Amino acid sequence: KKQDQESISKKKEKLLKGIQPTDEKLVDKHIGNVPIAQQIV
Amino acid sequence: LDTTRITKEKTLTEEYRLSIDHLKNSIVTKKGDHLYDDINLFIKQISV
Amino acid sequence: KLMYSLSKYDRLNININENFYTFLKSLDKVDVYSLKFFKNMIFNKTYSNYNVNLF
Amino acid sequence: XXXXXXXXXXXXXXXXXXXXXXXXXXXXXXXXXXXXXXXXXXXXXXXXXXXXXXXXXXXAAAAXXXXXXXXXXX
Numbered sequence: 001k002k003q004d005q006e007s008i009s010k011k012k013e014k015l016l017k018g019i020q021p022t023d024e025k026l027v028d029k030h031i032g033n034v035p036i037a038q039q040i041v
Numbered sequence: 042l043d044t045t046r047i048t049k050e051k052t053l054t055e056e057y058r059l060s061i062d063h064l065k066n067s068i069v070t071k072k073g074d075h076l077y078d079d080i081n082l083f084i085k086q087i088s089v
Numbered sequence: 090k091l092m093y094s095l096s097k098y099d100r101l102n103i104n105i106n107e108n109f110y111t112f113l114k115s116l117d118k119v120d121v122y123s124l125k126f127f128k129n130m131i132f133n134k135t136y137s138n139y140n141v142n143l144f
Numbered sequence: 145x146x147x148x149x150x151x152x153x154x155x156x157x158x159x160x161x162x163x164x165x166x167x168x169x170x171x172x173x174x175x176x177x178x179x180x181x182x183x184x185x186x187x188x189x190x191x192x193x194x195x196x197x198x199x200x201x202x203x204a205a206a207a208x209x210x211x212x213x214x215x216x217x218x
Contacts, residue, residue, distance in 0.1 A: 012204050018196060020189035026067065030114040035069045035216035037183045041119045068118055069216050075120060108178045113159055115181055124180060128166075128173045 058087055184213060 026034040061080060070077040096102070115121060129135045136142075166174045185208065191197070193212040200210040 008203055011199065015196065015200055015204055018191055019200075022187045022189045026069070028067075028118075031111065031118065031183050033184065033187055033215075034067070034118055036187065036213060037115065038069060038074075038119055039214045039216075040184070041115075041121075041181065064117070071216075109163060111181050111183060112163065112178050115183070116159055119181075121177075121181070124177050128170060128177055131173060132170070 054087065058084075 022033075024033055024035065028034055031037050061083060064076075065080060068076065070080070072078075112121070126135060166177065188210075191212075197211050204210075
């Protein structure tokens with residue numbers, strides 16, 4: 001049932017590199033991102 | 042009787058506008074957004 | 090203070106208030122007034138134009 | 145305490161009173177109306193929305209689900 005594959009610990013670092021945070025001018029305190037919360041609803 | 046009646050001193054016609062601008066700056070507006078239509082009218086309904 | 094009051098820090102007393110928490114502060118920014126309209130719409134507490142009335 | 149006696153009537157207490165009318169009357173839908181809202185906890189820029197979130201759930205997730213979302217044209 002085994003196969004030849006990579007390690008999951010490597011998969012961790014890969015996705016963390018592809019993801020990056022964001023910076024918006026409208027970042028309220030009680031609700032994080034105002035534009036994001038708008039379209040969700 | 043005149044103690045009750047309004048005067049132009051105590052009105053709020055500018056303090057509305059100051060708050061609405063705080064909304065537009067704070068809130069995103071688009072054509073799909075329900076606020077965009079009414080506010081741009083509201084601005085004309087003071088300055089006009 | 091803490092000695093006069095400490096029961097605030099139960100997980101259950103806080104996780105339950107977070108639902109009420111965001112609803113109050115997401116009030117001005119988002120169309121929750123619509124949610125109020127649908128909430129009344131289910132039980133027919135809305136009042137439309139097409140419909141008939143003797144009010 | 146004097147300030148509380150001063151800015152009493154000037155205080156805003158209408159929003160809180162509204163929710164009380166909600167939970168009291170429609171006790172059922174109110175649980176849904178409040179459950180409908182759930183802001184995102186953390187944002188994230190670049191990614192491949194197809195399966196990046198897929199693998200982002202399988203690995204690199206601890207008591208917190210990850211997923212895609214729209215934005216102001218993004």
